[PDB]
Each structure stands twice: as C-alpha cells, then as structure tokens.
Design a protein around this ligand. Structure first.
Ligand SMILES: [Cl-]
Ligand SMILES: [Cl-]
Ligand SMILES: [Cl-]
Ligand SMILES: [Cl-]
Length: 91
C-alpha cells in the first residue's frame, strides 16, 4: 500500500499506550515506546514512526505542546497518519 498507514486508536483504561517525542532539529513528532497489548499496538502504531496528521489535520510544523493538546482534546479516539522517516521526506 502506497498510502501512509492510518492508525485508528480508541483510548483504553490505561490510555492509548504510546509516547510522543520531539527533537525539533528533526521535523515534527515521533512515536516511541508502544506498550505491548495496547490500543496503539492494535491500531498498527510503531515506535520510530513520524506523525504527520492527527484527526485529519497536519501536525508536522506544530510544537510538541500543540500536538499533545490536539490528541488530549479529542473524544477518546484518534486517527494518526504516520510515515517511516527512513523512506519519507517532507519537502
Ligand atoms: Cl518519549
Ligand atoms: Cl475532528
Ligand atoms: Cl510510510
Ligand atoms: Cl522530513
């Protein structure tokens, strides 16, 4: 499939089960630490992924805090459009 993976997560009793990290010298936010047995894993999320959209909005050039706020404000379900940074570049 040529489209980016779209991971559709429903929040569980222990949250979504992943970490989000920025470095800022790098473009945008990255997935880390996808806990075994979590909504994140069931949805197909993988640590190393670069996060491109949250619920249909591009988050590549937003601050870490902005992206976290978007995710937290959503009503307990999020669709994360993600790419493999090794093979994917924003120009
Ligand atoms: Cl982290
Ligand atoms: Cl929405
Ligand atoms: Cl990809
Ligand atoms: Cl890039």
């Amino acid at each position: 499939g040529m489209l980016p993976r779209l991971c559709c997560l429903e929040k569980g009793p222990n949250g979504y089960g992943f970490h989000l990290h920025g470095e800022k010298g790098k473009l945008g936010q990255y997935i880390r630490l996808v806990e075994p047995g979590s909504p994140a894993e069931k949805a197909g999320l993988l640590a190393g992924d670069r996060l491109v959209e949250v619920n249909g909005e591009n988050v590549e050039k937003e601050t870490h805090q902005q992206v976290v706020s978007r995710i937290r404000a959503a009503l307990n379900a999020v669709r994360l459009l993600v790419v493999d940074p090794e093979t994917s570049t924003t120009l």
